[PDB]
Design a protein around this ligand. Structure first.
Ligand code: ATP
Ligand code: ATP
Ligand code: ADP
Ligand code: MG
Ligand code: MG
Lengths: 227, 889, 394, 384
């Protein structure tokens, strides 16, 4: 019943153990909340359906059906590169997927407020994997050179040197020609997915989803405004 | 599961042995031709050791066991052929037809009749056929027959010859490492009557091989490192003629016969000394064998080479006696002055340098007992021709100052200065002898017995120290004149001056410090006969020790020479002779474990060791026989130096838990001397375990017990990096561990390892393990230092010059007649081979290769190259002749 | 023969060892303590004797005294400061100022003086232990061995031949050349032969994160250095600890230079180190500061270059003395094949040339095995070879 | 516990019997030797009496301390957790050997005296940089190289498994091993089969992550790293991609290249320091071999230099056979057209094409992999 990392009640005269102090926080829920990512869903996706179908193939399948790749005798993918202009749904899709398949959506920023939960110094980034394999069905997410070396240091671990599975990384950025060529090793990246700016139809449905919570007046013709 | 198809062997042997009771009676042909077709087929289908899962040997006796139990017993008309077909098939699977109670019923198939010439169907196969079965014969069957029924019926008579041809089948099939299974047949066969099987396999071994003598020869000395006293009695005398009858290697005779000298018969190695004086083959091995007969494991040989051929081969004896002893001098005369040895190194006291500036100031320690150790700045550094001209003024100006036992001590250092000498060691003493002093003359004439030690030529049979003894009137003229004669003539065994010193024991003079070292004087000379020495001791023991209940002047000195007079035999007769001799009160029965275990230095008889600790374990002993129990642990200190690493781990594993940890007086007061008797070898296992109880001085005891373990802890020769440990303890030892009782003791401790850079082979293991006295001269000091009252007055006779059997250092010596060769050597770690493959890799310390008189070291095995072939002695022995030959182009 | 009979008579006593050694008491594998059979000195007496009369005697630091009276000025770790007093057991002699003293928690009076602070990262770089490197093993540069050894040990082993002649021996010496030439390997024979405090220093270990941080470490190093009488201070790869001063614009490499200036001050000026000898070694000496290169700090200036022919043959006889070879090979042929070559390369050729005999099934190398080493190590690795821009030391 | 290290007859002999019989009598001597002590000295229980006498010495508020010096006569200066250090004394149940500066000890609540010592809760980074299990399959997974694999077993594995061969030769194994070539050439892939094969304690570190933002934190990380490597066992230290310390500059580093330099100097010490090194092997790998300092590459620091070429086409088909071994290949395909598609394809390229083709089949829910899968697959993999 004595758990490591648990508060206690303590008497003061002989320091006799008194009572178990409930629980305090997870070291990931704490910092994770401090970040406050805007959680998302499929129901707020504006017209990105084939992108959904691609990312399901990379992430959804080696969770619900890990044997399905043993059906083909091929290894499961590990990494996802997402690209396109900003403001194009990268964050909400990335949060959305781990939200639906219930993976521990853990992005990193390289901030220093986050740092105190990782460790006292965390001379590597690899100390994160302690919490990551502790939330083992997890997804690491990264923004747009330190991100570039960081991802490489991830993939060098999970190239076979990490045995814990269901830990998959997603980097979201722009301008794919200017990143690393060793990152552009063809055995390195499993899939790169482009995010185009919206056409007139995909400008209409985001007006639809986004127009839900407003108090409207009858008769609008959103198509014109989408044009 | 692929069953069926090829089931001929679970069907037709399921048929024809089942149709054998239906085909023994009323079917005369099917009884014998199907038994023959059962014999050649179970024979042929089980000779190969690749399919040990035979198709009948684990298949037919599911019914063939009940068929055999109603076929061999229940037939009752067994003829002369049907037993040669019956018992040749039924005796083969019976180790696996039967389970673990086969052992009472191997004979219900085999002893009906052994079918013919059983090796005819045991020719190809190694051990599955019957050799395992014959091991089951000799394991249990021959043990129950030949426990008290050796001379018996078929269970011994044919079993000798069947135990002959199977033993030749070990050295018949492959000549693999299964040859060492034949000592497990000859030995497990008739354990105590080993001579009757060694007669059957000794002549067979004489016709066996000249190459397969060495690894089984080693295997036998492996089997002779330790045994019960009858098998160490028997296997070692059967061990002797194998390099004589079969082999003619013949040069490892004397040093490995020292083995077979004391337990079997003292005339046995004298008949092997005759066997030395029969093989007059050659100056080289003839020289090198008798080199060791003087100062390497024994003496008492210098009266047996004066035959009618005194030219050079029987004038070898003088060259053995002193001229190769002069080569031992010549080591220090030539070979040590070239490497580093200066006339006065002197600078370990200079190495005592830095305490004046480590933590303040100095000019503080001014004890007169410091000058006792300052005599060893002279004395210890000056062994092996460390001769000094007016560098002896630290003993000259302290020779006329105070400390009468220091007038004994500085005069007694000079014999340690002139060691192994006959030439001028009488001339150097007389320049300081004439001072008309009881204390200077007796220490100097005591050093006269030290100079000629090992010489035993005409120096003092009754010339000098007899003139020292007959001056008798008080102190050390009476005392220190009997010591050097037992010292130099300790290796002698002359009865005449033993009877010059027998009225010293039969004098019954009240000079008890003389009468106690009298037994220590006479015991060093003889170890065997002359029970009248023992009578002379025990008579004065009854006259004086009975009418008192006092100090260990009696106990440390008087029964010890009895252990010297009855050292070295496991016969357990001498325990009856001396243990029932001084039947008495328990403080004269202090001598109960003396002569018992002093006879038992190195053997295997740990049934004595259980009667060496079961009697008096603790008992709380309210200051009654803590002396008898510290002596009872003092006799635990043999049996451990030479069980070839067997009981040394069984001593360091035990005594650290038993006595020094969970003892009240034996461990805290005394029991550290096992680490000063077991070794001088040196290793960090104990070597870092003793300063845990030394650097923690634990002064609440009589702290000269721990400081008694200080210099003893420092007992190790072969100098090391331990100057940190000892000099740190003298650094805290300047202020603490008071110089009032320990100024002699810390520098005595420090100077002890570096006596000289060399001259440290003092540790009783020559060749590989044979003794070389080494105990009669060493042991009475650890007997002497039990407690107190001898760091000041009485023990200053012993604390200087107790052990002086330093049979030098090195083995790298050419000793060709020209002496122009240097060497071609390669020193290594000690070997590890017991049985291995092609030309057994000996050691693995290839990193070092030399050619000169360089160091010996403790765990070293040394070989060579260049096709020199080293044909002299080939094992060890440090005076190889080093002949050479080049039949290898 | 007695297969089970040796096995279970073996096994019941291998167990019966433990079955009564639990009844001895070695058990209850701890969390940080000692053997129960050992501690029994503090059993009934020191349990209430080294405890119940014994105080805590909290240690402090003296600020200063004042005249005519003790009236001492104490200082503690965090807390305030007092006017304090001695005990009777000590004299007011060794109660000098800036000293650590043991002080009771109640009367606040002084019990015993203490040694000052040592900063144990400096304590770690005392080696305490000697390597095995023989002067026999650095053969080929014997004049450098002599010219160094006459500086290093000869006053320490004989402080009379310099005194009675009336000269003060030098104190400082650098050792330099291309890498792998035997600089560090040469220093190991000194640390072998020596006896006093041999305190080694690698300069990159002084690279600190704070300001002045390594500079105080220098000071402390010379503090405990001045405690010892004779002491040898080793400096490896001092180009990290300083090239020179070149500052321009934004202050670049400021921090290293101040520590180097402290190293200057501890070496020369105002009643110096006395009997403290130093020994630097660099790879590229051309980067070094001239005031550092001023004599009185770096007097002896030993070069290490490649051996001519005979030193190289001697190095062959060093690394090659202890390996199974063909008897009738010659090394002078191989030294002819190695003009511009270090002894590390020679050793590497020895170790590869053994591996050729290890390749198929040979016990001793041959001459052509050595030739198989030569082209691979010398000529096939000749793209790298690391030497020539270090011959000019750039 | 370590009672008798001798086993050398290894047969059914009276030697091995008499061993135990001797040690049988000694162990019975220890039994009935200690048996009389409680028979005639009950006086206690001695199993918990003296033990709870120790535990009645030491109080339950056991404060956790840390050493900073030692005076031998069981008292020293010990630092508090607050920092206000004391000069307490040390007990006799402290088994005074495990006492080094900086260690955690056990103190009294009252007089803060040194009660006991404390076992240290390992280190987060040791586990982090410490590789736990074998990553993947053996050397049979690789294919095609077959020469330098003998080189790697030669310098690494054979010293481990057969320490007889160097001793009959009079030789020590080569020290440093380095790996270089084009990218994606199986450099890390060989090290995985090494990490499969070995039993030694294995460490792996990228060359990129050496660099720090604190001054000297890099070289400190090096010193504690080699501390960790030495303090464990026959250990294998691997470094990948050591060029990245010289290629890329990062603005997190406060220092410029003249801190990178000092890092490489401290590492350069740790290759070829005067201290006794021990049984640690060094495997290095990168692709830019011409860029770094050759002073680290000198013999004495690295002995073996191993290039990885591009695959020849008959080895390519083998690598296709490996990356198509367990997969349901529909017989529509011909691998030889897939070989010569790129002249200089890597072994990463083949597996990329194969796995991506499996992704294409799993788009269409299929089980076997057809020809057009490869046709559009190499369009995806190569051309972009
Ligand atoms: N004269 C020599 N004789 C034998 N071996 C040598 C000699 N010089 C160098 N070596 C070899 O070179 C290796 C490295 O020596 P050392 O560390 O002293 O090189 P260095 O000159 O200090 O250069 P660096 O500072 O880069 O190491 C050693 O392993 C040694 O075997
Ligand atoms: N010869 C080969 N046989 C089989 N697979 C190979 C081969 N070469 C490369 N691969 C595949 O390429 C992948 C990359 O291997 P690895 O990372 O070891 O190459 P690398 O040269 O170390 O790459 P990088 O240069 O990025 O470090 C491996 O997972 C492996 O499956
Ligand atoms: N397909 C979409 N549907 C709805 N909102 C979107 C979509 N794409 C972008 N947005 C809006 O853009 C923002 C998300 O930006 P995103 O592309 O996820 O990250 P980044 O801009 O950093 O790449 C959100 O506030 C979101 O409402
Ligand atoms: Mg160096
Ligand atoms: Mg790679």
């Amino acid at each position: 019943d004595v758990t490591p990392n648990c508060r206690v009640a303590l008497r003061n005269d002989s320091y006799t153990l008194h009572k178990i102090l409930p629980n305090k926080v997870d070291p990931l829920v704490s910092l994770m909340m401090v970040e406050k990512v805007p959680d998302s869903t499929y129901e707020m996706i504006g017209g990105l359906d084939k992108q959904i179908k691609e990312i399901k193939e990379v992430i959804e399948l080696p969770v619900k059906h890990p044997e399905l790749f043993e059906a083909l005798g091929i290894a499961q993918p590990k990494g996802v590169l997402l690209y396109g202009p900003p403001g194009t749904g990268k964050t909400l899709l990335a949060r959305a997927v781990a939200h639906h398949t219930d993976c521990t959506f853990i992005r990193v920023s390289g901030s220093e407020l986050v740092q105190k939960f990782i460790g006292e110094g965390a001379r590597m980034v690899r100390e994160l994997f302690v919490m990551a394999r502790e939330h083992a069905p997890s997804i690491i997410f990264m923004d747009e050179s330190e991100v570039q070396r960081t991802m490489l240091e991830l993939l060098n671990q999970l190239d076979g040197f990490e045995a814990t599975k269901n830990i998959k990384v997603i980097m979201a950025t722009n301008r794919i020609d200017i990143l690393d060529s060793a990152l552009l090793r063809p055995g390195r990246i499993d899939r790169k997915i482009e995010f185009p700016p919206p056409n007139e139809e995909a400008r209409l449905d985001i007006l639809k989803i986004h127009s839900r919570k407003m108090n409207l007046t009858r008769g609008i013709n959103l198509r014109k405004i989408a044009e | 599961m692929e069953e069926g198809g090829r089931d001929k062997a679970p069907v037709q042997p399921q048929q024809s042995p089942a149709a054998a009771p239906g085909g023994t009676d009323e079917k005369p042909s099917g009884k014998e031709r199907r038994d023959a077709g059962d014999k050649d087929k179970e024979q042929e289908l089980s000779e190969e050791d690749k399919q040990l899962q035979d198709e009948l040997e684990m298949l037919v006796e599911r019914l063939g066991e009940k068929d055999t139990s109603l076929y061999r017993p229940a037939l009752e008309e067994l003829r002369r052929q049907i037993r040669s077909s019956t018992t040749s098939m039924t005796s083969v699977p019976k180790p696996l037809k039967f389970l673990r109670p086969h052992y009472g019923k191997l004979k219900e198939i085999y002893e009906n009749m052994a079918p013919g010439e059983n090796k005819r169907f045991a020719a190809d196969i190694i051990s599955v056929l019957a050799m395992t079965m014959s091991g089951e014969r000799e394991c249990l069957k021959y043990r129950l027959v030949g426990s008290q029924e050796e001379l018996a019926s078929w269970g011994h008579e044919y079993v000798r010859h069947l135990a002959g041809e199977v033993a030749k089948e070990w050295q018949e099939l492959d000549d693999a490492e299964k040859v060492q299974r034949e000592p497990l047949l000859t030995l497990v066969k008739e354990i105590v009557p080993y001579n009757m099987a060694h007669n059957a396999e000794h002549e067979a071994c004489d016709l066996l091989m000249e190459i397969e003598q060495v690894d089984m020869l080693e295997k036998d000395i492996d089997e002779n490192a330790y045994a019960k006293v009858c098998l160490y009695l028997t296997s070692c005398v059967n061990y002797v003629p194998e390099p004589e009858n079969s082999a003619l290697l013949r040069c490892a005779l004397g040093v490995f016969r020292k083995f077979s000298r004391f337990p079997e018969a003292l005339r046995l190695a004298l008949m092997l000394n005759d066997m030395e004086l029969v093989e007059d083959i050659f100056t080289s091995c003839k020289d090198v064998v008798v080199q060791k007969q003087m100062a390497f494991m024994l003496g008492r040989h210098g009266v047996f080479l004066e035959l009618s051929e005194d030219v050079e081969e029987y004038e070898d004896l003088t060259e053995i006696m002193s001229n190769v002893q002069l080569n031992s001098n010549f080591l220090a005369l030539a070979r040590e002055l070239d490497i580093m040895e200066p006339k006065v190194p002197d600078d370990i006291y200079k190495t005592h340098l830095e305490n004046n500036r480590f933590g303040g100031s100095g000019s503080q320690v001014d004890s007169a007992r410091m000058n006792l150790a300052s005599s060893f700045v002279n004395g210890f550094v000056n062994a092996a021709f460390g001769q000094d001209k007016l560098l002896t003024d630290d003993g000259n100006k302290w020779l006329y100052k105070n400390k009468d036992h220091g007038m004994l001590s500085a005069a007694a250092s000079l014999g340690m200065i002139l060691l192994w000498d006959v030439d001028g060691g009488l001339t150097q003493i007389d320049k300081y002898l004439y001072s008309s002093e009881d204390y200077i003359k007796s220490g100097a004439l005591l050093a006269c017995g030290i100079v000629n030690s090992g010489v035993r030529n005409e120096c003092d049979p009754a010339l000098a120290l007899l003139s020292d003894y007959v001056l008798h009137n008080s102190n050390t003229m009476r005392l220190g004149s009997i010591f050097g004669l037992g010292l130099a003539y300790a290796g002698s065994n002359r009865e005449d001056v033993l009877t010059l010193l027998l009225p010293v024991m039969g004098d019954s003079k009240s000079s008890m410090e003389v009468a106690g070292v009298t037994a220590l004087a006479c015991g060093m000379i003889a170890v065997g006969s002359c029970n009248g020495d023992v009578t002379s001791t025990i008579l004065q023991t009854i006259m004086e020790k009975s009418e008192t209940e006092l100090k260990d002047t009696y106990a440390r000195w008087l029964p010890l020479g009895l252990g010297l007079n009855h050292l070295g035999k496991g016969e357990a007769i001498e325990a009856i002779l001396a243990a029932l001799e001084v039947v008495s009160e328990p403080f004269r029965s202090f001598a109960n474990t003396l002569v018992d275990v002093c006879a038992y230095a190195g053997s295997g008889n740990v049934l004595k060791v259980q009667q060496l600790l079961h009697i008096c374990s603790e008992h709380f002993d309210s200051k009654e026989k803590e002396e008898d129990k510290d002596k009872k642990e003092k006799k635990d200190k043999d049996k451990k130096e030479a069980p070839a690493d067997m009981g040394a781990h069984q001593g360091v594993a035990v005594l650290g838990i038993a006595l020094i940890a969970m003892g009240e007086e034996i461990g805290a007061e005394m029991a550290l001397r096992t680490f000063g008797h077991l070794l001088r070898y040196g290793e960090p296992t104990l070597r870092r375990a003793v300063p845990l109880a030394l650097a923690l001085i634990s002064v609440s005891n009589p702290r000269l017990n721990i400081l008694d373990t200080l210099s003893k802890f420092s007992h190790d020769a072969d100098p090391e990096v331990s100057y940190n440990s000892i000099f740190a303890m003298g650094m805290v030892g300047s202020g603490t561990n008071n110089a009032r009782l320990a100024a002699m003791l810390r520098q005595l401790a420090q100077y002890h390892a570096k006596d000289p850079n060399n001259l440290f082979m003092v540790r009783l293991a020559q060749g590989l393990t044979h003794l070389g006295k080494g105990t009669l001269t060493l042991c009475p000091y650890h007997s002497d230092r039990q407690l107190m009252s001898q760091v000041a007055v009485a023990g200053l006779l012993t604390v200087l010059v107790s052990f002086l059997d330093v049979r030098n250092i090195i083995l790298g010596k050419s000793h060709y007649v020209l002496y122009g060769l240097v060497a071609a050597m390669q020193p290594r770690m000690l070997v590890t081979f017991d049985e291995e493959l092609r030309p057994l890799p000996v050691s693995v310390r290839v990193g070092q290769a030399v050619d000169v008189v360089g160091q010996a070291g403790k765990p070293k095995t040394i070989t060579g190259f260049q096709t020199h072939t080293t044909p002299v002695l080939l094992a060890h022995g440090e005076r190889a002749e080093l002949a050479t030959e080049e039949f290898l182009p | 023969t007695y297969s089970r009979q040796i096995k279970q008579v073996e096994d019941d006593i291998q167990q019966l060892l433990k079955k009564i050694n639990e009844l001895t008491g070695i058990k209850e594998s701890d969390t940080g303590l000692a053997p129960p059979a050992l501690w029994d000195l503090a059993a009934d007496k020191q349990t209430l004797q080294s405890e119940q009369p014994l105080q805590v005697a909290r240690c402090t630091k003296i600020i200063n005294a004042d005249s005519e009276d003790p009236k001492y000025i104490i200082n503690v770790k965090q807390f305030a400061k007092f006017v304090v007093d001695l005990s009777d057991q000590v004299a007011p002699t060794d109660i000098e100022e800036g000293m650590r003293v043991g002080v009771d928690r109640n009367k606040y009076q002084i019990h015993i003086p203490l040694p000052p602070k040592i900063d144990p990262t400096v304590t770690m770089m005392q080696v305490e232990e000697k390597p095995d490197v023989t002067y026999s093993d650095v053969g080929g540069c014997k004049e450098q061995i002599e010219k160094l050894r006459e500086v290093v040990e000869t006053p320490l082993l004989h402080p009379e031949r310099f005194v009675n002649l009336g000269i003060e021996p030098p104190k400082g010496v650098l050792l330099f050349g291309p890498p792998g030439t035997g600089k560090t390997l040469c220093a190991r024979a000194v640390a072998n032969r020596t006896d006093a405090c041999f305190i080694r220093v690698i300069g990159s270990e002084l690279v600190q994160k704070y300001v002045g941080e390594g500079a105080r470490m220098v000071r402390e190093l010379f503090e405990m250095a001045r405690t010892k009488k004779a002491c040898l201070i080793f400096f490896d790869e001092i180009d990290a600890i300083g090239g020179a001063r070149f500052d321009d614009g934004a202050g670049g490499d400021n921090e290293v230079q101040r520590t180097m200036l402290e190293l200057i001050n501890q070496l020369d000026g105002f009643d110096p180190r006395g009997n403290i000898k130093v020994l630097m070694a660099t790879n590229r000496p051309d980067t070094l500061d001239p005031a550092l290169m001023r004599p009185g700090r770096l007097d002896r200036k030993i070069e290490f270059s490649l051996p001519d022919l005979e030193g190289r043959t001697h190095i062959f006889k060093i690394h090659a003395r202890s390996m199974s070879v063909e008897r009738d090979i010659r090394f002078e042929l191989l030294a002819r094949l190695c003009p511009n070559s270090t002894g590390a390369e020679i050793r590497s050729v020895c170790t590869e040339a053994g591996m050729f005999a290890i390749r198929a099934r040979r016990k001793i190398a041959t001459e052509k095995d050595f030739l198989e080493a030569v082209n691979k190590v010398i000529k096939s690795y000749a793209k790298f070879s690391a030497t020539p821009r270090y011959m000019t030391y750039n | 516990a370590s009672k008798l290290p001798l086993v050398t007859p290894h047969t059914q002999c009276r030697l091995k019997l008499l061993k135990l019989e001797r040690i049988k009598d000694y162990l019975l001597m220890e039994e009935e030797f200690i048996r009389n002590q409680e028979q005639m000295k009950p006086l206690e229980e001695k199993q918990e009496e003296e033990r709870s006498k120790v535990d009645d010495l030491r109080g339950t508020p056991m404060s956790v301390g840390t050493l900073e010096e030692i005076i031998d006569d069981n008292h020293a200066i010990v630092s508090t957790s607050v920092g206000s250090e004391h000069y307490v004394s040390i007990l006799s149940f402290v088994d005074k050997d495990l006492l080094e500066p900086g260690c955690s000890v056990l103190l009294n609540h009252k007089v803060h005296a040194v009660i006991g010592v404390l076992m240290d809760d390992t280190d987060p980074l040791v586990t982090v940089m410490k590789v736990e299990k074998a990553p993947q399959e053996t050397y049979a997974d690789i294919g095609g190289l077959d020469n330098q694999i003998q080189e790697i077993k030669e310098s690494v594995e054979l010293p481990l498994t057969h320490p007889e061969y160097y001793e009959e030769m009079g030789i020590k194994p080569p020290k440093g091993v380095i790996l270089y070539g084009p990218p994606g050439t199986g450099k890390t892939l060989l090290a995985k089969a090494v990490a499969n094969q070995t039993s030694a304690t294995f460490l792996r570190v990228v060359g990129s992550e050496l660099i720090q933002k604190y001054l000297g934190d890099g070289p400190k990380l090096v010193r504690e790293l080699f501390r960790v490597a030495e303090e464990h066992a026959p250990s294998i230290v691997f470094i990948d991609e050591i060029d990245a310390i010289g290629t890329k500059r990062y603005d997190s580093n406060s220092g410029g290249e003249r801190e990178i330099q000092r890092t490489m100097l401290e590492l350069l010490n740790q290759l070829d320091g005067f201290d006794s090194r021990g049984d640690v092997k060094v495997i290095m790998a990168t692709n830019r071999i011409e860029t770094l300092d050759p002073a680290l590459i000198r013999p004495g620091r690295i002995d073996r230099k191993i290039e990885f070429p591009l695959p020849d086409e008959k080895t390519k088909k083998r690598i296709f056979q490996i990356h198509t071994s367990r997969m349901t290949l529909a017989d529509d395909v011909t691998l030889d057209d897939l070989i010569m598609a790129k002249d200089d394809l890597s072994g990463a390229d083949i597996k990329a094409i194969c796995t991506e083709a499996g992704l294409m089949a799993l788009r269409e829910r299929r089980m076997k992999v057809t020809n057009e899968d490869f046709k559009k697959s190499k369009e995806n993999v190569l051309y972009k």
